Nucleic acid binder design. Structure first.
Lengths: 94, 338, 56, 338, 157
DNA sequence: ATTGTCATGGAATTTCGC
DNA sequence: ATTGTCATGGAATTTCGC
């Protein structure tokens, strides 16, 4: 049937910073399974952040704390500020 | 027993007056008329309606749910002040769509003219207001500042700054946004200027705030025919399309021309008082509206007695909590069947 | 009748990883009961920074 | 150049007509008058106002933000039907406070009388409505059922059940809750009966629903002087305080008395049409209201041309989406300066 | 006294036991003495519990003056009696209906028997033809008697 | 111990031309 | 090819007593 994936959304990032670059099949699955794992670390730490503060709600604040825990040092400085651009751009729209 | 031209009706005893009506009232909790036509199926006696009114004043399940069919009277147009920097009408707008980490915009309208002032903040705290006016008290000092009974203005901290400046704080009656007059109008101006600029782009409205207190402050009042700049200062600044009609005059003498410009302005018209108006009376029973009425709950509280009447629109009532809650007469209802 | 132009929420934030697919992987993964409207936006950005940084 | 009694004014060239006004319009995006007084500081020429109107019809940043100052006209009172089971006005209430796993109450008011019917459900789906009426279609079959354009009624499934019964579905104009007449009234009755019963206890309102369609259905209409039971059936059931005035008659003959009871009922009064009314014209440009207007967004859409006028309150417009959206005239505004 | 009026004397009639559809067993056929209107409020069990829960639906629309039928289980208990005392209905317990029972005991028995669950699917459909049956005693249908109007649709005919 | 309002377009009104 | 409404209390109105 249908296997959902993140394979298509890699070519929309691979062709942003290296537009003359292909990527193999068996290397797609790593960047596929990199996403699904780094998804449920951030979600599965934001999930356990909901119980620790007695709320049933995953806000966009709780994903920010569950990225300042998993990412160390200098990735935790960029991937926070690479999200709050994509939210402030999002909320000024619609 | 008695005979009527619609059939045979029954005269009940004098001991059976309160019982027979109360069992007909509580069948559908009606008022004066649908109560009465239930009794008009079995019974009849002289002065039916003197007993139905005797019921409803005790039935405190029906006084705190039915709303009044008696509107409040004519609205008051209070006069304009005679100088600027006398009444500021302040009210946060927002949460707007975000820009630069800003969501809330303090709006300080002068009550003299309409000259708006904008001071955007991150969150409507007490201290976000206090530094927002320290920019504006750098210009001049007001006598009175009106507002609404905000979360940030009613704080005991905000009043202690306000007594330093000589600010006479003035608060509206609660759940009455109509009391703050001009600021509720200019917030329909700011959201019709920033609406018109931001058509077809992301709402980056933190860029356009120096525009708004220069674009609205040079819009001619179309029923006063002046700029907010002229009624505040006296002459235009270097703006596009500025008057040269004042350059044929001396500034040392048109100061006292300006005081006669300010006292010839249009005053609004009071509407005619409609037929079903009602007036408060000191001693009359009144019922406030419940503040935030939850679902399937009384719209109104228990009755209360008017202590003092201040004008024909503002009345001090004595609530069930023991509260001297100075409410409007667009809050209250006349207590039914006194 | 017809309706308006369906603008995807990945194009309303300037990202490439979806937000519609992430927002049903926060309500079918039992992470919590309520998931805010901004949270799968913010998470699809952090999935997009780190997908570049390896491929860069 | 020209001389005026207020100073010297400037006559611009004919090539400089559109440019000089458009740069004064976009300074504050005003309409006809505050635009004009900007030009009354430097310029003057014969027919100033024929050019300002020439601006605003092209300025599509100002047509979709300013709202109309022209009210719609007199409301229509449509006539009552002549039989029961002709128009049902249905609308879910709720989410209420919960009881027994119920939150939503279908309310089926007869348009003949006011005889309410209640059928509580768990969630306002299509199938929760369908089994709720299979109880009620057990009684009799209506010709027409009015509603609002609900989430559950507009489903393609719900219409396929409705064609089985002979139900003529009728939907209101969108974002117009005033169209569904009686059901919006009896929902202010059900929430004034269930409000009055549930004072001072937990809101266990699933117990009190067999009470409500027996307590409201025997409230005398105080301007018609009848029960909903009598105007639906003809005589009271075994209720407290039921009429014996019909027991002096024959039921075999008061059936045709009842058809003359139904045609003597009070009809409401149309209000007088106010001065600033306006009428739709087939060919006039109109602007719908934006459905759910987000913050700092146009209140109105782009102009549209009226295809057909159905009554003086209901008009079919041709939207920007290519939509024949049959809206009310309490939605539309007259497009400024045609 | 006065001629026969509606809502005086219901005659409560069960049919079954039909095979269950969502648990329901006994079709609580109610026929009035004067109008002969048909309420089908079927029950899962003929108890004082599991039939008064169907007689909340009837006593929301209309209240009869005499509750009277044959003897059974739901009609002998004093819990049923005290319930009937609050509703002001005189119990008698601890011409058109016989023609309506001719559909019941002969026709509607062998037409509801044969469906395990499907009989519940046509309870609102069978009922509307049972609100239009010609009484030569009265020369009206139970629809034309009870509402004071004639038939709406040829689907309600 | 407080209170609507005010921009805005038909439409009515006034100016006034000669 | 759709449209307010209707319970409700002063208050005005009518009955009518003799």
């Amino acid at each position: 049937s249908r296997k959902e994936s993140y394979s298509v959304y890699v070519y929309k990032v691979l062709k942003q910073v290296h537009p003359d670059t292909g990527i193999s099949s068996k290397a797609m699955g790593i960047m596929n399974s990199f996403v699904n794992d780094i998804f449920e670390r951030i979600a599965g730490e934001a999930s356990r952040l909901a119980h620790y503060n007695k709320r049933s709600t995953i806000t966009s604040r709780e994903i920010q704390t569950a990225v300042r825990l998993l990412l160390p040092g200098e990735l935790a400085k960029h991937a926070v500020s690479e999200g709050t651009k994509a939210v402030t751009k999002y909320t000024s729209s619609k | 027993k008695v005979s009527r031209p619609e059939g045979v009706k029954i005269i009940p005893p004098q001991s059976d007056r309160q019982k027979i009506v109360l069992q007909a009232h509580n069948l559908a909790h009606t008022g004066r008329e649908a109560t009465l036509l239930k009794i008009a199926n079995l019974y009849w006696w002289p002065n039916m309606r003197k007993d139905v009114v005797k019921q409803l004043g005790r039935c405190q399940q029906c006084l705190i749910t039915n709303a009044s069919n008696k509107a409040s009277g004519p609205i008051l147009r209070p006069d304009r002040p005679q100088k600027p920097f006398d009444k500021f009408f302040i009210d946060y707008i927002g949460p707007l769509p975000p820009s630069q980490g800003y969501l809330y915009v303090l709006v300080v309208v002068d009550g003299m003219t309409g000259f708006t002032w904008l001071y955007p903040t991150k969150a409507p705290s007490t201290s976000a207001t206090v530094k927002s006016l320290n920019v504006l008290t750098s210009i001049a000092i007001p006598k009175v500042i009106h507002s609404d009974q905000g979360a940030a203005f009613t704080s005991s901290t905000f009043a202690e700054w306000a007594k330093e400046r000589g600010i006479h704080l003035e608060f509206s009656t609660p759940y009455h946004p109509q009391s703050s007059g001009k600021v509720e109008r200019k917030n329909s101006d700011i959201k019709r200027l920033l609406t018109k600029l931001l058509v077809g782009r992301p709402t980056k409205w933190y860029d356009l705030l120096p525009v708004v207190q220069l674009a609205l402050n040079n819009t001619y009042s179309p029923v006063l025919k002046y700029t907010p700049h002229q009624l505040l200062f006296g002459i235009d600044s270097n703006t596009p399309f500025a008057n040269q009609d004042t350059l044929d005059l001396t500034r040392e003498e048109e100061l006292s021309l300006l005081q006669e410009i300010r006292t010839s302005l249009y005053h609004p018209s009071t509407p005619p008082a409609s037929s079903r108006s009602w007036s408060p009376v000191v001693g009359q029973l009144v019922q406030e509206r419940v503040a935030r009425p939850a679902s399937l709950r009384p719209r109104w509280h228990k009755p209360s007695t008017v202590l003092k009447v201040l004008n024909p629109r503002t009345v001090v009532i004595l609530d069930h909590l023991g509260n001297n809650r100075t409410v409007s007469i667009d809050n209250l209802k006349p207590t039914s069947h006194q | 009748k017809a309706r308006a132009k369906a603008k995807t929420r990945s194009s309303r934030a300037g990202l490439q990883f979806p937000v519609g697919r992430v927002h049903r992987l926060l309500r079918k993964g039992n992470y919590a009961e309520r998931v805010g409207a901004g949270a799968p936006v913010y998470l699809a950005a952090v999935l997009e920074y780190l997908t570049a940084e390896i491929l860069e």
